[PDB]
Amino acid sequence: KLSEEQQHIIAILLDAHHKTYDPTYADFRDFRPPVRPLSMLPHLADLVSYSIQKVIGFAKMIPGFRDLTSDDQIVLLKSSAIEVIMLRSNQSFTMDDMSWDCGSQDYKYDVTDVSKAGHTLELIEPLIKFQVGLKKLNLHEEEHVLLMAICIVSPDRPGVQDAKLVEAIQDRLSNTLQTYIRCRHPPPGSHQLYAKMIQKLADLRSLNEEHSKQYRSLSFQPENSMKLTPLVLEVFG
C-alpha cells in the first residue's frame, strides 16, 4: 500500500516532469536548424543543451534534492545529465521507424540523423537498442519519472561527498517505485519490472561512458567544439 509520503513524491515528480518536458516540442524552433557529416551537430548540440537545462529544472523539484550541498547537486547533474536525456527521450521514441518523433518531420530523428553529429554507431546502435528495451517495459508515467529521479540521485557518482544522504534520498525514491509497482502495476506487465528498470540504469552507465569517450574525440578538435554551446562545454568538459 502506498503511504501518504509516497503518493506526494509521485504527484511532485509527475508535475516536475510536466513542467520540464513539453510534448509539443514548441521550443525546437529556437534551435539552430537541422541539416540532413557533422551537419546535424548545431541542431542536436542545441537540443542537448536545452535538454540539459530542462533536466536541471526537473532535478531541482526531486524531494530531498534541495537538502544536498551545491557541490553535490553539481556532480550528480554533471554525471546524470546525458543518461536522463536518454531516459526522457523514450517518450518521443517510436519503434515503428526506430526514430525520435518530436512533433514534425523537421524534428524527427533517425539513426542517420543522430549519426550526423560526430558520434559513431558504437554509441548510437546501443542507444537505439536501449530505447527499444525501455519502450517494451511500457512504463506508467509514474514509473518513468521515478526512474529519472533515481538516476539523478545515485550515491556512487564520481566526486560525491555526502554519499549517505544521496543514498537516503534515492532509497525514499526506490521504495516508492517498488511499492508503486506492487500496488498499481497489474501483472503480467509488473513481472520483475523493478529489476528490469534498475538494469536500465546499468545500461545507461555504459552509454554514458561511451558518450564520454566520443565527446572527448569530437571536442579535441576546436572547430567542432566551436559548434557546441557553453553549457554543453561546461557539463561534458
Binding site: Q53, I56, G57, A59, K60, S70, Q73, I74, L77, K78, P230, L231, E234, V235
Partner: peptide, 10 residues
C-alpha cells in the same frame, strides 16, 4: 568549478 550549472541549480 561550473558557473552555469551552479547558476541554474540555485
Amino acid at each position: 568549478n561550473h558557473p552555469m550549472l551552479m547558476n541554474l541549480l540555485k
